[PDB]
Amino acid sequence: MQIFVKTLTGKTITLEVEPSDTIENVKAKIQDKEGIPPDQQRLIFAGKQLEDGRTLSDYNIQKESTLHLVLRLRG
């Protein structure tokens, strides 16, 4: 299985994943490719924001699906 991760500015990151992969797991994959800490990560699927505990299948995310990556900072 393979999904796409969308970056703010632009570019198409492609992630190789499993359907039962947890959202924490995807974030760990992104960290390898984008050196971005999972704490500063926010994944969006079809407008919705995903949560660490649920897996790709819980959100009914199949292959060739795009998740929008959005850094999360504050102060």
Side-chain angles (χ1 to χ4, degrees):
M1 178 180 279
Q2 193 180 75
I3 57 180
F4 299 106
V5 183
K6 221 57 144 46
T7 31
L8 199 46
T9 292
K11 231 345 129 234
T12 298
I13 307 177
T14 286
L15 287 186
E16 169 58 32
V17 300
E18 289 134 357
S20 284
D21 241 318
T22 53
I23 291 300
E24 296 172 60
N25 273 15
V26 180
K27 289 199 174 177
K29 289 160 159 63
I30 289 182
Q31 193 177 190
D32 291 339
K33 284 182 116 293
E34 303 296 291
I36 301 171
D39 309 306
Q40 303 173 186
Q41 294 199 61
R42 173 170 55 222
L43 290 169
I44 306 305
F45 176 56
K48 186 188 175 180
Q49 182 177 297
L50 311 182
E51 326 187 310
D52 282 18
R54 307 185 82 191
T55 65
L56 294 177
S57 52
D58 288 356
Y59 286 99
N60 199 66
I61 300 173
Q62 314 151 173
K63 61 180 165 50
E64 295 167 21
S65 313
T66 308
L67 287 65
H68 297 309
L69 177 58
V70 187
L71 274 61
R72 191 225 319 175
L73 308 313
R74 43 204 158 304

XYZ file of all heavy atoms in Angstrom:
597
model
N 0.844 -1.225 0.000
C 0.000 0.000 0.000
C 0.854 1.240 0.000
O 1.906 1.280 0.635
C -0.916 0.027 1.217
C -1.766 1.271 1.281
S -2.833 1.305 2.706
C -4.157 0.273 2.113
N 0.371 2.263 -0.696
C 1.089 3.525 -0.827
C 0.153 4.734 -0.803
O -0.843 4.764 -1.515
C 1.842 3.508 -2.150
C 2.869 4.579 -2.334
C 3.549 4.452 -3.673
O 2.969 4.787 -4.702
N 4.778 3.936 -3.671
N 0.469 5.725 0.021
C -0.337 6.935 0.088
C 0.553 8.108 -0.251
O 1.754 7.954 -0.421
C -0.930 7.191 1.491
C 0.188 7.264 2.532
C -1.958 6.134 1.828
C -0.296 7.521 3.936
N -0.046 9.286 -0.346
C 0.694 10.497 -0.655
C 0.541 11.433 0.527
O -0.516 11.467 1.159
C 0.110 11.177 -1.892
C 0.165 10.346 -3.137
C -0.989 9.764 -3.648
C 1.356 10.167 -3.817
C -0.954 9.011 -4.816
C 1.399 9.414 -4.987
C 0.237 8.838 -5.487
N 1.598 12.175 0.840
C 1.537 13.148 1.920
C 1.808 14.511 1.301
O 2.817 14.707 0.628
C 2.569 12.871 3.007
C 2.398 13.867 4.135
C 2.400 11.457 3.527
N 0.888 15.443 1.522
C 0.981 16.788 0.970
C 1.687 17.771 1.896
O 1.386 17.850 3.091
C -0.425 17.289 0.661
C -0.570 18.053 -0.639
C -0.105 17.236 -1.831
C -0.978 17.527 -3.038
N -1.220 18.987 -3.244
N 2.621 18.528 1.330
C 3.383 19.516 2.091
C 2.832 20.943 1.850
O 2.289 21.218 0.780
C 4.876 19.390 1.717
O 4.997 18.950 0.356
C 5.538 18.348 2.601
N 2.946 21.833 2.841
C 2.411 23.198 2.721
C 2.818 23.909 1.436
O 2.005 24.027 0.511
C 2.793 24.047 3.937
C 1.904 25.286 4.108
C 0.445 24.883 3.932
C 2.128 25.911 5.475
N 4.072 24.344 1.364
C 4.592 24.975 0.156
C 4.233 24.161 -1.087
O 3.514 24.640 -1.963
C 6.121 25.146 0.223
O 6.452 26.119 1.221
C 6.664 25.601 -1.123
N 4.738 22.933 -1.157
C 4.463 22.060 -2.285
C 5.329 20.813 -2.311
O 6.262 20.676 -1.520
N 5.015 19.901 -3.227
C 5.767 18.657 -3.369
C 4.935 17.451 -2.936
O 4.084 17.562 -2.054
C 7.063 18.719 -2.560
C 8.308 18.350 -3.351
C 7.947 17.664 -4.658
C 8.651 18.316 -5.838
N 7.692 18.732 -6.896
N 5.185 16.303 -3.557
C 4.456 15.089 -3.222
C 5.284 13.982 -2.599
O 5.955 13.229 -3.306
C 3.740 14.521 -4.465
O 2.777 15.472 -4.932
C 3.043 13.212 -4.135
N 5.232 13.885 -1.273
C 5.949 12.828 -0.559
C 5.112 11.558 -0.701
O 3.896 11.578 -0.468
C 6.052 13.075 0.963
C 6.629 14.451 1.266
C 6.921 11.995 1.587
C 6.661 14.733 2.755
N 5.755 10.459 -1.076
C 5.058 9.192 -1.199
C 5.490 8.281 -0.060
O 6.679 8.077 0.164
C 5.359 8.507 -2.542
O 4.669 9.189 -3.597
C 4.903 7.064 -2.516
N 4.515 7.755 0.672
C 4.787 6.865 1.787
C 4.317 5.441 1.506
O 3.220 5.218 0.994
C 4.094 7.365 3.058
C 4.618 8.592 3.800
C 3.842 8.774 5.108
C 6.089 8.408 4.088
N 5.168 4.479 1.834
C 4.840 3.070 1.667
C 4.330 2.713 3.052
O 5.029 2.929 4.032
C 6.106 2.302 1.319
C 5.983 0.802 1.372
C 4.909 0.269 0.465
O 4.669 0.883 -0.594
O 4.323 -0.777 0.808
N 3.108 2.196 3.141
C 2.512 1.881 4.441
C 1.678 0.602 4.477
O 1.487 -0.069 3.460
C 1.591 3.033 4.905
C 2.391 4.312 5.038
C 0.450 3.224 3.921
N 1.195 0.247 5.659
C 0.327 -0.918 5.774
C -1.055 -0.361 6.081
O -1.173 0.738 6.610
C 0.754 -1.826 6.923
C 2.035 -2.593 6.712
C 2.930 -2.503 7.930
O 2.560 -1.804 8.900
O 4.007 -3.121 7.923
N -2.121 -1.105 5.748
C -3.455 -0.578 6.045
C -3.716 -0.468 7.549
O -4.391 0.439 7.989
C -4.382 -1.568 5.340
C -3.613 -2.847 5.364
C -2.200 -2.405 5.057
N -3.170 -1.376 8.344
C -3.391 -1.324 9.782
C -2.367 -0.456 10.487
O -2.215 -0.522 11.701
C -3.365 -2.739 10.370
O -4.568 -3.445 10.090
N -1.659 0.357 9.714
C -0.639 1.256 10.249
C -1.296 2.320 11.130
O -2.281 2.911 10.716
C 0.067 1.958 9.092
C 1.541 1.663 9.039
O 2.176 1.660 10.114
O 2.067 1.448 7.921
N -0.776 2.577 12.328
C -1.367 3.619 13.175
C -0.915 4.998 12.710
O 0.104 5.120 12.049
C -0.978 3.472 14.655
O 0.445 3.381 14.781
C -1.628 2.264 15.250
N -1.670 6.036 13.052
C -1.305 7.389 12.637
C 0.048 7.799 13.221
O 0.762 8.624 12.636
C -2.401 8.424 13.031
C -3.657 8.185 12.196
C -1.914 9.850 12.772
C -3.426 8.312 10.714
N 0.398 7.227 14.373
C 1.684 7.510 14.998
C 2.754 6.919 14.084
O 3.814 7.492 13.888
C 1.771 6.849 16.377
C 0.783 7.372 17.396
C 0.771 6.548 18.677
O 1.823 6.449 19.339
O -0.295 5.998 19.025
N 2.455 5.760 13.522
C 3.372 5.086 12.639
C 3.648 5.898 11.390
O 4.790 5.974 10.943
C 2.815 3.717 12.257
C 3.185 2.634 13.258
O 3.625 2.919 14.375
N 2.995 1.377 12.862
N 2.612 6.502 10.816
C 2.786 7.300 9.604
C 3.700 8.467 9.938
O 4.646 8.767 9.208
C 1.432 7.832 9.080
C 1.625 8.662 7.825
C 0.513 6.668 8.785
N 3.416 9.121 11.058
C 4.218 10.251 11.503
C 5.696 9.896 11.647
O 6.565 10.718 11.384
C 3.684 10.785 12.835
C 2.363 11.510 12.735
C 2.187 12.363 13.942
C 0.962 13.214 13.844
N 0.789 13.998 15.102
N 5.973 8.672 12.080
C 7.340 8.219 12.242
C 7.972 8.046 10.860
O 9.181 8.219 10.692
C 7.367 6.919 12.993
N 7.152 7.700 9.871
C 7.644 7.525 8.510
C 7.988 8.904 7.957
O 9.018 9.091 7.303
C 6.577 6.855 7.641
C 6.344 5.403 7.977
C 5.003 4.886 7.476
C 4.999 3.348 7.351
N 5.186 2.552 8.614
N 7.124 9.874 8.233
C 7.351 11.227 7.760
C 8.634 11.768 8.378
O 9.456 12.373 7.694
C 6.159 12.160 8.111
C 4.944 11.803 7.250
C 6.537 13.615 7.874
C 3.747 12.697 7.478
N 8.813 11.532 9.671
C 10.010 12.002 10.360
C 11.265 11.561 9.624
O 12.226 12.314 9.527
C 10.056 11.481 11.801
C 11.095 12.182 12.656
C 11.097 11.719 14.096
O 11.757 12.316 14.948
N 10.364 10.645 14.380
N 11.267 10.341 9.104
C 12.437 9.866 8.384
C 12.630 10.650 7.097
O 13.737 11.076 6.787
C 12.313 8.381 8.058
C 12.389 7.506 9.288
O 12.926 7.966 10.316
O 11.924 6.348 9.221
N 11.546 10.851 6.356
C 11.615 11.575 5.095
C 11.699 13.088 5.216
O 12.338 13.733 4.390
C 10.425 11.207 4.201
C 10.545 9.836 3.544
C 9.364 9.550 2.624
C 9.797 9.403 1.166
N 10.322 10.658 0.534
N 11.069 13.658 6.236
C 11.079 15.109 6.396
C 11.745 15.632 7.666
O 11.691 16.827 7.948
C 9.649 15.635 6.323
C 8.941 15.250 5.037
C 9.596 15.853 3.801
O 9.517 17.093 3.638
O 10.187 15.089 2.999
N 12.378 14.745 8.425
C 13.037 15.156 9.653
C 12.162 16.018 10.539
O 12.674 16.805 11.328
N 10.846 15.867 10.413
C 9.894 16.642 11.206
C 9.372 15.840 12.388
O 8.807 14.767 12.208
C 8.693 17.067 10.361
C 9.173 17.907 9.174
C 7.709 17.838 11.222
C 8.108 18.207 8.140
N 9.548 16.357 13.615
C 9.092 15.689 14.842
C 7.599 15.415 14.794
O 6.828 16.244 14.316
C 9.442 16.693 15.937
C 10.613 17.415 15.371
C 10.234 17.619 13.932
N 7.167 14.242 15.280
C 5.736 13.924 15.263
C 4.897 14.851 16.146
O 3.683 14.943 15.986
C 5.706 12.473 15.728
C 6.979 11.942 15.167
C 7.961 13.028 15.527
N 5.549 15.540 17.072
C 4.853 16.459 17.956
C 4.433 17.709 17.189
O 3.407 18.317 17.485
C 5.765 16.840 19.120
C 6.367 15.628 19.800
O 5.595 14.729 20.202
O 7.607 15.578 19.933
N 5.234 18.079 16.195
C 4.972 19.251 15.367
C 4.239 18.851 14.105
O 4.124 19.650 13.178
C 6.282 19.923 14.960
C 7.169 20.349 16.109
C 8.520 20.853 15.635
O 9.399 21.143 16.443
N 8.692 20.960 14.319
N 3.761 17.611 14.059
C 3.048 17.110 12.887
C 1.544 17.092 13.062
O 1.025 16.806 14.142
C 3.496 15.689 12.525
C 4.920 15.567 12.052
C 5.163 14.276 11.303
O 4.549 14.029 10.273
N 6.058 13.447 11.813
N 0.852 17.404 11.976
C -0.597 17.395 11.947
C -0.971 16.877 10.572
O -0.680 17.515 9.558
C -1.153 18.802 12.153
C -2.655 18.904 11.962
C -3.158 20.257 12.413
N -2.456 21.354 11.755
C -2.053 22.455 12.379
N -2.281 22.603 13.676
N -1.427 23.412 11.710
N -1.588 15.700 10.543
C -2.001 15.082 9.290
C -3.483 15.297 9.024
O -4.326 15.072 9.892
C -1.674 13.592 9.310
C -0.169 13.373 9.252
C 0.164 11.928 9.533
C 0.337 13.806 7.894
N -3.784 15.738 7.808
C -5.152 16.007 7.392
C -5.603 15.064 6.269
O -4.920 14.921 5.251
C -5.291 17.476 6.891
C -4.789 18.434 7.967
C -6.739 17.784 6.537
C -5.461 18.248 9.271
N -6.746 14.413 6.468
C -7.294 13.523 5.454
C -8.711 13.941 5.122
O -9.624 13.800 5.944
C -7.307 12.070 5.918
C -7.955 11.139 4.932
C -7.501 11.074 3.617
C -9.026 10.348 5.305
C -8.106 10.239 2.695
C -9.632 9.518 4.390
C -9.171 9.464 3.082
N -8.889 14.447 3.906
C -10.196 14.902 3.456
C -10.722 15.950 4.422
O -11.841 15.839 4.926
C -11.174 13.728 3.365
N -9.901 16.961 4.685
C -10.309 18.017 5.589
C -10.195 17.698 7.068
O -9.961 18.603 7.866
N -10.358 16.432 7.448
C -10.259 16.067 8.861
C -8.823 15.905 9.377
O -7.889 15.645 8.614
C -11.033 14.777 9.154
C -11.072 14.441 10.642
C -11.674 13.076 10.925
C -11.584 12.734 12.413
N -12.160 11.393 12.731
N -8.663 16.069 10.687
C -7.366 15.929 11.335
C -7.337 14.538 11.974
O -8.267 14.157 12.684
C -7.201 17.019 12.393
C -5.868 17.015 13.114
C -5.743 18.164 14.091
O -5.761 19.334 13.702
N -5.615 17.837 15.371
N -6.270 13.784 11.714
C -6.128 12.419 12.230
C -5.567 12.337 13.655
O -4.881 13.246 14.119
C -5.254 11.608 11.269
C -5.682 11.743 9.806
C -4.810 10.887 8.909
C -7.128 11.338 9.677
N -5.851 11.237 14.345
C -5.391 11.083 15.716
C -4.511 9.861 15.999
O -4.875 8.725 15.699
C -6.597 11.059 16.643
C -7.738 11.952 16.192
C -8.835 12.032 17.232
O -9.272 10.960 17.714
O -9.256 13.162 17.567
N -3.362 10.128 16.607
C -2.354 9.135 16.978
C -2.777 7.673 17.193
O -2.105 6.755 16.726
C -1.632 9.621 18.237
C -0.587 10.686 17.949
O -0.627 11.304 16.861
O 0.273 10.900 18.828
N -3.875 7.450 17.906
C -4.297 6.088 18.176
C -4.899 5.279 17.045
O -4.600 4.098 16.912
N -5.742 5.900 16.230
C -6.403 5.199 15.135
C -5.494 4.837 13.960
O -4.495 5.502 13.695
C -7.598 6.026 14.650
C -8.568 6.409 15.773
C -9.812 7.121 15.248
N -10.818 6.188 14.743
C -11.894 6.555 14.047
N -12.099 7.840 13.771
N -12.771 5.644 13.629
N -5.851 3.772 13.253
C -5.065 3.323 12.119
C -5.645 3.820 10.803
O -6.788 4.253 10.741
C -4.984 1.783 12.072
O -6.286 1.240 11.840
C -4.445 1.237 13.375
N -4.842 3.749 9.749
C -5.246 4.190 8.424
C -6.589 3.630 7.998
O -7.351 4.304 7.317
C -4.194 3.788 7.386
C -2.818 4.428 7.449
C -1.936 3.827 6.386
C -2.957 5.917 7.251
N -6.880 2.395 8.383
C -8.139 1.789 7.992
C -9.308 2.326 8.793
O -10.426 2.354 8.299
C -8.067 0.269 8.113
O -7.612 -0.113 9.397
N -9.057 2.756 10.025
C -10.130 3.304 10.843
C -10.694 4.536 10.147
O -11.892 4.790 10.190
C -9.622 3.688 12.237
C -9.311 2.481 13.102
O -9.565 1.346 12.649
O -8.816 2.668 14.235
N -9.821 5.295 9.500
C -10.223 6.493 8.789
C -10.552 6.148 7.349
O -10.745 7.032 6.517
C -9.097 7.525 8.821
C -8.924 8.191 10.156
C -7.939 7.771 11.043
C -9.758 9.234 10.544
C -7.793 8.369 12.285
C -9.620 9.845 11.781
C -8.636 9.409 12.646
O -8.497 10.017 13.872
N -10.613 4.857 7.056
C -10.911 4.393 5.711
C -9.995 5.022 4.662
O -10.451 5.489 3.619
C -12.361 4.689 5.353
C -12.848 3.846 4.202
O -12.954 2.625 4.320
N -13.142 4.486 3.077
N -8.700 5.027 4.958
C -7.688 5.567 4.060
C -7.064 4.391 3.313
O -6.427 3.524 3.914
C -6.599 6.322 4.850
C -7.237 7.485 5.618
C -5.513 6.821 3.905
C -6.304 8.202 6.553
N -7.267 4.362 2.004
C -6.756 3.294 1.159
C -5.507 3.780 0.459
O -4.929 4.788 0.846
C -7.795 2.933 0.104
C -9.208 2.785 0.635
C -10.258 3.127 -0.412
O -11.457 2.940 -0.190
N -9.812 3.642 -1.554
N -5.106 3.075 -0.591
C -3.919 3.453 -1.347
C -4.209 4.645 -2.239
O -5.359 4.958 -2.530
C -3.440 2.296 -2.223
C -4.452 1.859 -3.252
C -3.926 0.725 -4.089
C -5.050 0.047 -4.853
N -5.919 1.000 -5.590
N -3.146 5.303 -2.677
C -3.268 6.447 -3.556
C -4.120 7.570 -2.954
O -4.720 8.370 -3.672
C -3.818 5.972 -4.905
C -2.856 5.020 -5.645
C -3.513 4.298 -6.822
O -4.544 4.805 -7.313
O -2.996 3.243 -7.266
N -4.148 7.632 -1.626
C -4.890 8.662 -0.910
C -3.906 9.730 -0.436
O -2.768 9.420 -0.092
C -5.602 8.049 0.286
O -6.270 6.863 -0.101
N -4.340 10.986 -0.414
C -3.464 12.074 0.004
C -3.809 12.630 1.380
O -4.958 12.965 1.649
C -3.508 13.256 -0.995
O -3.277 12.788 -2.327
C -2.445 14.266 -0.650
N -2.807 12.713 2.250
C -2.982 13.278 3.585
C -2.222 14.595 3.572
O -1.087 14.644 3.105
C -2.380 12.374 4.658
C -3.075 11.063 5.028
C -3.052 10.103 3.846
C -2.366 10.447 6.233
N -2.835 15.659 4.074
C -2.171 16.958 4.091
C -1.392 17.185 5.387
O -1.965 17.174 6.478
C -3.190 18.089 3.892
C -3.887 18.054 2.566
N -3.209 17.971 1.370
C -5.202 18.113 2.247
C -4.073 17.979 0.371
N -5.290 18.065 0.877
N -0.083 17.391 5.246
C 0.808 17.629 6.378
C 0.851 19.107 6.775
O 1.094 19.978 5.942
C 2.220 17.156 6.033
C 3.312 17.394 7.077
C 2.939 16.718 8.384
C 4.636 16.864 6.550
N 0.617 19.384 8.053
C 0.635 20.757 8.548
C 1.382 20.847 9.884
O 0.960 20.263 10.888
C -0.803 21.298 8.739
C -0.766 22.773 9.097
C -1.609 21.081 7.473
N 2.498 21.572 9.887
C 3.292 21.747 11.095
C 2.426 22.373 12.170
O 1.524 23.147 11.867
C 4.502 22.642 10.818
C 5.761 21.966 10.275
C 5.490 21.309 8.934
C 6.851 23.007 10.157
N 2.703 22.043 13.425
C 1.923 22.575 14.530
C 2.797 23.255 15.575
O 3.477 22.591 16.349
C 1.136 21.445 15.192
C 0.075 21.906 16.181
C 0.115 21.082 17.463
N 0.317 19.665 17.191
C 0.482 18.743 18.130
N 0.466 19.086 19.411
N 0.679 17.480 17.784
N 2.775 24.582 15.595
C 3.548 25.346 16.567
C 2.603 26.291 17.313
O 1.432 26.419 16.949
C 4.642 26.156 15.866
C 5.591 25.426 14.915
C 6.096 24.164 15.582
C 4.874 25.097 13.619
N 3.107 26.949 18.354
C 2.300 27.888 19.132
C 3.104 28.643 20.182
O 4.214 28.247 20.539
C 1.128 27.156 19.795
C 1.505 25.831 20.409
C 0.298 24.915 20.508
N 0.705 23.516 20.601
C 1.479 22.904 19.706
N 1.928 23.570 18.647
N 1.807 21.625 19.865
N 2.529 29.744 20.662
C 3.179 30.563 21.669
C 2.390 31.829 21.956
O 1.813 31.926 23.062
